[PDB]
Amino acid sequence: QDRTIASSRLRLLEYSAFMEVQRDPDTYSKHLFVHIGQTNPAFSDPPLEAVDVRQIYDKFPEKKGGLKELYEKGPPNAFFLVKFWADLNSEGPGAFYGVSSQYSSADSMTISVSTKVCSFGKQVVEKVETEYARLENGRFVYRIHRSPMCEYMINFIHKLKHLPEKYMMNSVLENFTILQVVTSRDSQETLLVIAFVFEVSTSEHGAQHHVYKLVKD
Numbered sequence: 094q095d096r097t098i099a100s101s102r103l104r105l106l107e108y109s110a111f112m113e114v115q116r117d118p119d120t121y122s123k124h125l126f127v128h129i130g131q132t133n134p135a136f137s138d139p140p141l142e143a144v145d146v147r148q149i150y151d152k153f154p155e156k157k158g159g160l161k162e163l164y165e166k167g168p169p170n171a172f173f174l175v176k177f178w179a180d181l182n183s184e185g186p187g188a189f190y191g192v193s194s195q196y197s198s199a200d201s202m203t204i205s206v207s208t209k210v211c212s213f214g215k216q217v218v219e220k221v222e223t224e225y226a227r228l229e230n231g232r233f234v235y236r237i238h239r240s241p242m243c244e245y246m247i248n249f250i251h252k253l254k255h256l257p258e259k260y261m262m263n264s265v266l267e268n269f270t271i272l273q274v275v276t277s278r279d280s281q282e283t284l285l286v287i288a289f290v291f292e293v294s295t296s297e298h299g300a301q302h303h304v305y306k307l308v309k310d
């Protein structure tokens with residue numbers, strides 16, 4: 094069906110992770126490490142490929158809160174895997190590091206958004222954010238705007254760039270994952286689960302991404 098990152102209850106319209114600096118009072122420069130933009134589905138476009146959830150359980154935390162138990166509760170429709178090719182080709186005291194996200198739903202809800210930064214399948218840090226529905230045409234939208242990045246990730250990015258070669262970065266990135274779970278805050282119902290895996294863009298093509306459905310046949 095749709096290549097969209099969407100369950101039946103919630104769609105990810107946009108995601109970006111960026112650094113922003115002020116060159117001069119009038120001028121700002123903004124660099125996106127990763128970017129998913131709103132795109133509209135195209136009839137021609139092919140169905141999403143599938144990846145077995147069992148193959149990524151190790152990459153992500155386990156036991157409660159883990160990918161296996163979340164998939165068990167469901168819904169299976171809501172689980173997606175996104176691979177990012179990060180643009181590291183961008184040094185300023187006082188640059189801002191932020192993550193911006195947008196979501197859409199048919200029904201107004203108060204959503205809770207958990208973001209877990211993981212190393213070797215284990216959680217370094219978690220963020221829990223509350224967001225509220227805003228009316229738009231034919232839909233309700235939820236905007237996370239300029240959420241500051243955790244200090245771990247800022248340090249991880251600077252030292253990642255210090256590495257002399259991209260294959261080294263890729264070797265690090267193999268055990269770096271992010272797992273995002275969006276729930277209705279009160280019901281705790283799962284609306285959307287995104288597992289993120291990473292590779293450095295080995296070209297100056299810049300930020301690139303690929304979406305997969307997560308299946309448990």
Ligand SMILES: NC(=O)CC[C@H](NC(=O)N1CCc2c(cccc2-c2ccc(C(F)(F)F)cc2)C1)c1ccccc1
Pocket residue numbers: 110126127179180181192194206208209210218219220222237240241242243246249250253271289291
């Ligand atoms: N709503 C949110 O997200 C939460 C805010 C913030 N969120 C964040 O810290 N991140 C971390 C960064 C991030 C994120 C999402 C997707 C991709 C990246 C990213 C990955 C790799 C690179 C690079 F390849 F360049 F290294 C750059 C960006 C998100 C956070 C998270 C956990 C604990 C406290 C605060």
